[PDB]
């Protein structure tokens, strides 16, 4: 148990950076889709100012 909590922030930082990178990638991709017609890709549907990972994507 103490071994796993010694490992936790090391792995949590890695999944953290993956979440940041792929989230910003998705936001820029939807920005490059919706060019032209006016639509705020950058605005988040949550009213809180805190950052949130996207979900519920279009079926690939």
């Amino acid at each position: 148990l103490w071994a796993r909590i010694y490992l936790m922030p090391l792995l949590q930082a890695e999944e953290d950076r993956q979440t940041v990178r792929r989230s910003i990638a998705q936001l820029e991709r939807e920005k490059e889709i919706m060019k032209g017609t006016g639509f705020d890709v950058d605005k988040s549907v949550y009213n809180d100012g805190k950052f949130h990972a996207p979900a519920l994507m279009i079926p690939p």
Binding site: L11, Q18, R22, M57, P59
Partner: protein
Amino acid sequence: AIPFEALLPYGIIFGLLTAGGGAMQVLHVYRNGGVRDRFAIDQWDSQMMERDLRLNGGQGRKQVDQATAPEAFKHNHVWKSERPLI
């Protein structure tokens, strides 16, 4: 004294279960690639096995040890897309 004819079908049952277990263990080790099975797998352990399969490159439990990870390693990260569940 002890009858061999009574214990001879038990000798068969013993030999069939013994050869079965031995052949199965050899098939499990040939599946892993020379090492033993993992007999109880946590959620943590399952995520960790997926991470290792991402680290080594293709092979199941090659178990690499390197200082610094490769460059395709930062890009081969996967998310799992689950269907609607209607």
